[PDB]
């Protein structure tokens, strides 16, 4: 019977009309637009200026817009990964060198980043968030993040790939975040003078594997296996992130790198153990009803779209 | 008969029992006269209840929410120690039965399978069955299952502990009034108590009435019940297995709580409602068979909507998210279904839940010996042998051979003797 | 009678993916030389 | 089973990044 | 010719029974000369 189903789904795998308006009536949900939560995370109760979801884009005027300027004490203490407080000497939309180290500074938005004339701060092209200043983010403008989606096919003991809705089912490594206790894709901000290649791999070993300061040293063949796994990665998306720490002058934009294990040999040798800024790490099933941190569901949608997997 | 004056309370060392006066020991349990009261007064409501057409009496203790579950555990141990002597059969399994509060009818084949498996598991492991204790639904059903066990077996009868909120129980005033203990107190389930309407199940062997001073409020005993099962599990070095039959929206949260703390669950498929929701969700996420390939999150959402009927879409989303969160780890959920497993496979599901739990290899081999599953023990020994755990095999082989000799399992005796266990190297459990 | 809140969503999901397969003249017996019926055909296919 | 495997492998048969340096 | 591990090793009972039964049957039917290392450890001790 399993083959009878398999053969049945093997044959079913301007002229477009949407008639849903006849059932519901007048539509116009406009739920696509992202509005961050009112209480800023880890700020001690500091609240933004609320904005309905139909008032977010920059084309609309909105004269009653009075955002609050807030910068976190950790960012204001000036570490190595934080930009200077006066952004007039910072050049945006091109690769900029600060202390001889390269920073990307280019946004994936087609219009680009517009510079305010009064203060020199960048303006978020993806809409209003009811808050100026940098907040918890260290860099003015685009904070480049790299996410690592290490995937394998969900298999049963017998070795057959699990199949739901006529498509093969994926499985990804998910970490439980230290700050807000929501499951998420491993990843982190791109450091100064380094590229997405080093960052994706380094953050996955530090967070999902605990290879920074929370696990014993790997064997000489396991490192070769992990290197073999990490040698074939495809950039599936470069999107804006529906991150609650985003402001009007500092926003997170992610590059997503998918490491897919077709055979499943390299993925099975991983000893998952939460480290750094992660509590627990596990192999989790990919589906459309997942409740993950920020816009990681969109990232998983892009991974399954590229691999023709179930979502 | 003659009221007890002294009890053998087990020491904190776990090696002996001391004799002490009943009024001295029972002082540590408190009760609340009203909701406003917080400190409370010492409990005068403890003793035994006599139920019509039942020969034996069931002990009852009314205890506060702030009371130590170890003290309640000591009370249950003291009752068993009093009735059956000091060397009573210790439980190797704690069976928590949760599910539907309201009354429900199950199919006869499914009911027969659940009854047969639960009776076999309870009689082989001397298990402590913890339910809600009231005379409705899954608690009444579990009582009916253990009623035949109390008739067909002599000497030790496995306890059916009922942990219930005191504020909903008919006859609470009758139990409270008097001088404790109440030896053979008549319980009148048909007596018209005005504010309360939920009676106790007459087939439960022991009752813990958790009191907080409230009246006609449910769900106040859940945390204490979970704490008591965990305390019993640590004390007897025994796995805790939750069993889910039907159930409402709170049963989903209870199962969620159980899987977050590492406690395995056995979900009875085909019993309807939350059990069907949990069984679908697991089968959607894990089962490789063909009939489960058409399972979708949309049909699951439709099933949740038709059974639990939420008021809002967000409530439906939270219930669906919680249901998918419970079956995340495939080891901690075991689904029993009639059309897949079989009529005589419920005890096998209980044994798979036991093996999936956290415990030592020797204890798991002992549990496999109790259920008379030689193939499971052979596979466990082979897997342990392959994974470099040979030291633990040699460390537990003597005790496993001893246990096999005591419980009359000759095939297991042959199996343990074949893996280089010298017959003249046996050691006693105690010190001479 | 009025449909449930999940059946309306199911029907809306069904009606959201339609393809115009043909726009043809109709061999309708009520057609005349000065008034004729021409049809646009919309197919809603349920794969699952 | 041989066909089950065969059907399983019959369906699996600028955007390139090498992260082995990490 | 029996070759293998010099150091001592424990085999599963079914596998040991199968090797023992087959080797005994082959040796008794063919009047075979069994050549091993001759020491009281491992595969030599097992063959003995
Ligand atoms: N541009 C950046 N914005 C914010 N945090 C950054 C940035 N670059 C590096 N980091 C570090 O990355 C860590 C990860 O964020 P968190 O999960 O909040 O600990 C932060 O705590 C910072 O120490
Ligand atoms: O730097 P941490 O806080 O560890 O993670 C940053 C996350 O913020 C999200 O937008 C990105 O998807 C990225 O995964
Ligand atoms: Mg980081
Ligand atoms: Mg991170």
Helix/strand/coil (H/E/C) assignment for every residue in B279-308: HHHHHHHHCCCCCCCCCCHHHHHHHHHHHH
Whether C15 and chain A come into contact, CB under 8 Å, resolves to yes
> Residues 6 or more apart from B407 whose CB is under 8 A from it?
B369, B370
Residues 6+ apart with CB under 8 A from A73: none
Estimate to the nearest angstrom the gap between the alpha carbon of A295 and the chain centroid: 6
Tell me which ligand sits closest to the C-alpha of residue A143.
Answer: 1
Give first-to-last CA distance, chain C, whole Å: 26
Please tell me the residue having the least CA distance from ligand 2 atom 2: A188
- Chain B nearest CA to E17, separation (Å): 11
Residue count of chain A:
311
How many CB atoms within 10 Å of residue B298? 16
Q: Kindly report the CA angle at B237 between B124 and B27, in degrees rounded to 5?
A: 100
Residue in B408, B394, B100, B18 with CA at minimum distance from that of residue B275: B100
Residues in CB range of B157: below 8 A, 6 or more apart: B149, B150, B205
Residue B320 CA to its chain's centroid (Å): 27
Residue A82 CA to residue A94 CA, distance in Å, equals 18
**B221 three-class SS:** coil
Count of CB atoms within 10 A of residue B196's CB? 16
DSSP A27-40: ----TTS----SBP
Obtained via which technique?
cryo-EM
Burial (CB count <10 Å: 0-12, 13-18, 19+), residue B105: exposed
Pairwise CA distance, residues B321 & A112, whole Å? 38
Task: Measure CA of the first residue to CA of the last residue in chain D; give whole Å.
Answer: 40
Give bridge partners of residue A164 from the DSSP assignment. Answer: A167
DSSP state of D17: B
Best probe of the E interface among B386, B418, B421, B422, by most E CBs < 10 A, is B418
Q: Token match 């790198």: residue?
A: A257
A253 within ligand 2 shell (Cβ under 6 A): no
Closest CA to B84 of B185, B8, B149: B8
Grouping H, G, I as helix, E, B as strand and the rest as coil, residue B375 is helix
What stretch of H or E contains A305? Answer: helix A296-307
Half-sphere exposure of A167 (CA within 13 A, CB side): 15
User: Could you give the C-alpha distances from B162 to A143, B27, B142, E8, in angstroms and in order?
Assistant: 57, 22, 11, 56
d(CA B172, CA B389): 54
Phi, psi of A275 (to 5 degrees): -140, 175
Triad B114, B116, B117: Cα angle to 5°: 65
Q: Which atom of ligand 1 is nearest to the CA of A178?
A: 17
**Alpha-carbon distance values, A107 to A65, A139, A145 (Å):** 24, 13, 12
Provide the pairing of β-strand B128-131 with B160-165: parallel
* Widest distance between CA atoms in chain E: 30
Pairing of strands B265-268, B333-336: parallel
Residue with tokens 């076999």: B120
d(CA B386, CA B379) in angstroms, rounded, equals 10
Closest Cα to residue B133, out of B165, B164, B177, B112? B164
Which secondary structure element, helix H or strand E, spans residue B336, and what is its range?
strand B333-336
Burial B23-50 (b: 16+ CB within 10 A, else e): eebbeebbbbeeeeeeebeebbbbbbbb
- The answer to whether the beta carbons of residues A244 and A254 sit under 8 Å apart is no
The DSSP line for B259-279 is HHTT--EEEETTS-THHHHHH
Distance CA B387, CA B88 (A): 37
Q: How far is the CA of E32 from the centre of ligand 2 (A)?
A: 72
Instruction: Tell the residue nearest (CA) to atom 11 of ligand 1.
Output: A189
B113, B205, B248 from B107: Cα distances, Å: 10, 27, 19
3-class state of residue B6 by DSSP: strand
* Dihedral sign (CA A84, A90, A96, A100): negative
Tell me if chain B has a CB within 8 Å of the CB of A280.
no
Q: Where are the alpha helices (DSSP H) in A171-274?
A: 196-207, 220-230, 265-268
Q: Name the residue of A43, A78, A81, A136 whose CB sits within 8 Å of the most ligand 1 atoms, as the mutation to test its pocket.
A: A81
| Residue B133 backbone zone (phi > 0: left; psi -120 to 50: alpha; other: beta) | left
Nearest-angstrom CA–CA distance, A310 and B22: 64
Mutation for testing the B interface, residue in E8, E9, E10, E17 having most B CBs under 10 Å: E10
Distance CA B29, CA B41 (A): 9
Residue A125: CB atoms within 10 A of its CB come to 18
- In the DSSP assignment, the letter for residue A161 is B
The two tokens of residue A103 are: 């920073």
Neighbours of B431 (CB within 10 A): 4
Residue A86: closest CA among A119, A124, A113: A119
Contact status, residue B416 vs residue B401, Cβ threshold 8 Å: yes
Residues, chain C, total?
A: 48
Check if the beta carbon of residue A144 is closer than 8 Å to that of residue A189.
Answer: yes
Joined together, the tokens standing for residue A54 give 């139909």
3 state DSSP class of B231: helix
The angle subtended at Cα B357 by Cα B355 and Cα B360, nearest 5°, is 75
B61 φ/ψ angles, rounded to the nearest 5 degrees: -140, 125
Ligand number nearest to the C-alpha of A72: 1
Say how far apart CA B100 and CA B134 lie, in whole Å. Answer: 11
* Pick from B25, B21, B26: nearest CA to B4: B21
φ and ψ at B246, to 5 degrees?
50, -125
Using DSSP's 3-state secondary structure scheme, residue A122 falls into strand
Token pair listed for B212: 């907080």
**Residue A13: closest CA among chain D residues belongs to which residue?**
D11
Rounded CA-CA distance A211/A202 in Å is: 9
Are B167 and B223 a contacting pair, CB within 8 Å?
Answer: no
Distance CA B99, CA B66 (A): 25
Residue B4 per-residue DSSP state: P
Please name which of B348, B324, B320 lies closest in space to residue B335, comparing C-alpha atoms: B348
SS3 A194: coil
DSSP A219: P
Distance A293 CA to ligand 2 centre (A): 9
Verify whether ligand 2 is closer than 6 Å to residue A241 (CB atom).
yes
Q: Which of A40, A58, A41, A59 is nearest to A49 (CA)?
A: A40
CA–CA gap between residue B148 and residue B428 (Å, rounded): 36
Say how far apart CA A119 and CA A125 lie, in whole Å.
17
Which residues 6+ apart lie within 8 Å of B318 measured at CB? none
Picking from B132, B138, B141, the residue whose alpha carbon sits closest to that of residue B224 is B132
| Count of CB atoms situated within 10 Å of the CB of B430 | 5
Residue A297's nearest CA partner among A237, A222, A251 is A237
Which residue's CA is minimally distant from atom 12 of ligand 1? A189
Tokens 């939460």, located at residue: A274
- Whether A187 is in the pocket of ligand 2, judged by its Cβ within 6 Å, is yes
3-state secondary structure of A118: coil
What CA–CA distance (Å, rounded) separates A203 from A197? 10
- Full 3-state SS string of A37-104: CCECCCCCCCECCCCCCCCCCCCCCCCCCCCEEEECHHHHCCCCCCCCCCHHHCCCCCCEEECCEEEC
10 Å CB burial of residue B290 (0-12, 13-18, 19+) is middle
Q: Which residues contact E36 (CB under 8 A, 6 or more apart)?
A: E1, E2, E3, E43, E44, E47, E48
What is the 8-class DSSP label of residue A260?
A: E
Instruction: Judge whether A247 and A135 are in contact, CB under 8 Å.
Output: yes
Map residue A221 onto helix, strand or coil.
helix
The 10 Å CB-count burial string (b at 16+, else e) for A148-172 is bbbbbbbbeeeebbbbbbbbbbbbb
Beta strand pairing status for A234-240 and A163-164? unpaired
Place of tokens 């495809």: A234
Please say whether the beta carbons of C15 and A19 come within 8 A.
yes
Q: Quick check: helix, strand or coil at residue B157?
A: coil
- Distance of alpha carbon B373 from alpha carbon B385, whole angstroms: 19
CA-CA-CA-CA dihedral for A164, A165, A169, A173, to nearest 10: -100
Q: Tokens 């938005």 appear where?
A: A109
Ligand 2 pocket residue status of A294, Cβ below 6 Å:
yes
Of A283, C48, C17, A311, nearest in space to B297 by CA: A311
Give C10-44 as a 3 state SS string.
HHHHHHCCEEEEEEEECCCCCCCCCCCCEEEEEEC
In this structure, how many other beta carbons lie within 10 angstroms of the beta carbon of residue A116?
13
Q: How far apart are CA E11 and CA E25, in angstroms?
A: 20
Whole-number Cα distances in Å, A1 to A7, B291, B306: 10, 9, 30
Q: Are B278 and B327 in contact (CB under 8 A)?
A: yes
d(CA E18, CA E24): 10
Contact list in E for residue B418 (CB cut-off 8 A) is: 13
With contact defined as beta carbons under 8 Å apart, do D21 and A230 qualify?
A: no
Question: Rounded to whole angstroms, how far apart are CA atoms A201 and A223?
Answer: 12
**Token couple for B150:** 């109390």
User: What is the spatial distance between Cα A43 and Cα B54, in angstroms, rounded to a whole number?
Assistant: 63
Name the residue among B259, B230, B262 with its Cα closest to residue B244: B259
Task: Give CA–CA dist A11/B144, Å, rounded.
Answer: 53
Residue B60 host element (H or E): strand B58-64
Burial of C35 (0-12, 13-18, 19+ CB in 10 A): exposed
- In 3D space, the residue among A148, A147, A150, A153 whose CA is nearest the CA of residue A308 turns out to be A153
CA distance B67 to A25: 58
CB B270 within 8 A of CB B237: no
Q: Checking DSSP bridges between strand A170-177 and strand A278-285, what pairing results, if any?
A: antiparallel
The pair of three-digit structure tokens given for residue E26, joined into one six-digit string: 């082959």
For residues D17 and A235, give the distance between their C-alpha atoms in angstroms, rounded to a whole number. Answer: 7
Write out the DSSP string of chain E: -----SS-----HHHHHHHHHHHHHHHHHHTPPP-----SSHHHHHH-
What is the rounded distance in angstroms from the CA atom of residue A184 to the CA atom of residue A290?
10
In whole angstroms, give the CA distance from residue B352 to residue B368: 9
Q: Are A163 and A271 in contact (CB under 8 A)?
A: no
Name the resolution in angstroms: 2.0
Q: Of B14, B373, D16, B49, whose CA–CA distance to A233 is shortest?
A: D16
Six-digit token string for A277? 């800024």
Closest CA to B302 of E27, A111, A293, C4: C4
Owner of token pair 């992660």:
A278
Q: How far is CA B121 from CA B146, B158, B281, B412, B416, in A?
A: 11, 10, 26, 18, 23
Those residues whose C-beta lies under 8 Å from the C-beta of residue B247, and which sit 6 or more positions away, are: B98, B99, B100, B138, B254, B255, B273, B274, B275
Does residue B181 have a cis peptide bond before it, meaning omega lies within 30 degrees of 0? yes
CA distance B38 to B32: 7
Residue B119, token pair as written in the block: 């009776």
B314 close contact with C: CB closer than 8 A: no
d(CA B179, CA B185) in angstroms, rounded, equals 12
Q: Please tell me the distance from the alpha carbon of residue A248 to that of residue A113, in angstroms, as a whole number.
A: 11
Residue B163: DSSP 8-state: E
Quote the CA–CA distance of B143 and B161 in Å, as a whole number.
10
Q: What is the number of alpha carbons within 13 Å of residue A110 lying toward its C-beta?
A: 0
Coil, strand, or helix at residue B40?
coil
């Amino acid at each position: 019977i399993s083959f009878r189903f398999s053969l049945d789904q093997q044959a079913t795998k301007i002229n477009r009309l949407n008639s849903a308006v006849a059932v519901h009536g007048h539509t116009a949900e406009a739920a696509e637009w992202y509005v961050p939560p009112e209480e800023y995370p880890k700020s001690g109760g500091v609240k933004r200026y609320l904005i309905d979801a139909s008032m977010v884009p920059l084309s609309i005027m909105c004269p009653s817009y009075d955002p609050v300027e807030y910068t976190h004490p950790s960012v204001a203490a000036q570490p190595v990964w934080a930009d200077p407080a006066d952004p007039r000497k910072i050049k945006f939309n091109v690769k900029d060198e600060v202390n001889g180290k390269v920073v990307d500074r280019t946004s994936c938005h087609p219009s680009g980043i517009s510079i305010d004339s009064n203060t020199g701060r960048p303006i978020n092209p993806w809409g209003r968030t009811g808050m100026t200043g940098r907040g918890l983010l260290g860099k003015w403008g685009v904070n480049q993040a790299a996410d690592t989606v290490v995937t394998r096919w969900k298999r049963s003991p017998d070795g057959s790939i699990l199949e739901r809705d006529g498509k093969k089912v994926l499985e990804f490594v998910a970490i439980q975040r230290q700050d807000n206790k929501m499951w998420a894709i491993p990843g982190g901000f791109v450091d100064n003078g380094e590229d997405v290649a080093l960052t994706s791999g380094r953050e996955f070993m530090e967070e999902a594997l605990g290879m920074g300061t929370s696990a014993d040293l790997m064997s000489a063949e396991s490192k070769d296996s992990l290197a073999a796994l990490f040698s074939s990665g495809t950039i599936v998306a470069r999107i804006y992130c529906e991150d609650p720490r985003n402001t009007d002058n500092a926003w997170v934009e992610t590059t997503c790198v998918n490491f897919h294990d077709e055979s499943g040999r390299h993925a099975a040798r991983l000893k998952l153990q939460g480290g750094d800024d992660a509590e627990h790490a596990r192999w989790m099933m990919v589906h459309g009803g997942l409740n993950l941190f920020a816009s990681h569901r969109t990232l998983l949608q892009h991974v399954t779209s590229a691999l023709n997997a179930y979502f | 008969s003659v009221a007890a004056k002294t009890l053998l309370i087990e020491n904190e060392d776990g090696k002996g029992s001391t004799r002490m006066e009943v009024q001295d020991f029972m002082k540590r349990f408190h009760m609340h006269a009203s909701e406003d009261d917080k400190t409370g007064s010492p409990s005068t409501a403890w003793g035994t209840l006599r139920f019509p057409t039942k020969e034996a009496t069931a002990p009852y203790l009314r205890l506060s929410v702030n009371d130590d579950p170890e003290d309640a555990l000591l009370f249950v141990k003291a009752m068993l120690a009093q009735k059956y002597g000091e060397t009573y059969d210790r439980p190797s399994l704690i069976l928590s039965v949760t599910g539907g509060a309201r009354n429900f009818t199950l199919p006869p084949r499914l009911e027969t399978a659940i009854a047969k498996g639960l009776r076999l598991a309870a009689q082989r492991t001397n298990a402590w069955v913890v339910t809600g204790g009231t005379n409705t639904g899954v608690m009444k059903l579990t009582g009916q299952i253990m009623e035949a066990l109390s008739k067909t077996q002599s000497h030790f009868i496995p306890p059916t502990i009922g942990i219930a909120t005191y504020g909903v129980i008919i006859g609470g005033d009758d139990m409270t009034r008097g001088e404790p203990p109440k030896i053979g107190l008549e319980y009148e389930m048909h007596k018209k108590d005005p504010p309360k309407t939920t009676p106790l199940d007459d087939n439960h062997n022991l009752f813990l009435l958790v009191d907080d001073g409230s009246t006609n409020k449910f769900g106040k005993e859940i945390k204490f019940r979970a704490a008591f099962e965990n305390a019993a599990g640590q004390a007897f070095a025994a796995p805790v297995v939750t069993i889910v039959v039907q159930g409402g929206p709170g049963t989903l949260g209870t199962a969620l709580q159980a899987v977050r703390q590492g406690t395995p669950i056995v979900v009875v498929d085909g019993s309807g409602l939350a059990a069907d929701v949990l069984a679908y969700a697991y089968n959607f996420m894990h089962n490789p068979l063909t009939r489960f390939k058409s399972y979708t999150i949309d049909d699951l959402r439709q099933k949740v909507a038709q059974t639990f009927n939420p008021k809002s879409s967000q409530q439906l989303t939270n219930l669906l998210d919680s249901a998918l969160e419970c079956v995340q780890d495939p080891n901690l959920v075991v689904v029993y279904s009639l059309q897949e497993s079989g009529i005589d496979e419920f005890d096998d599901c209980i044994l798979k839940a036991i093996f999936s739990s956290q415990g030592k290899l020797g204890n798991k081999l002992k549990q496999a010996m109790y259920f008379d599953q030689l193939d499971v023990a052979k596979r466990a020994l082979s897997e342990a042998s392959k994974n470099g755990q040979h030291n633990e095999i040699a460390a537990c082989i003597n005790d496993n051979l001893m246990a096999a000799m005591m419980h009359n399992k000759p095939h297991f005796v042959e199996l343990y003797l074949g893996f280089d266990a010298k017959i003249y190297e046996l050691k006693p459990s105690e010190e001479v």
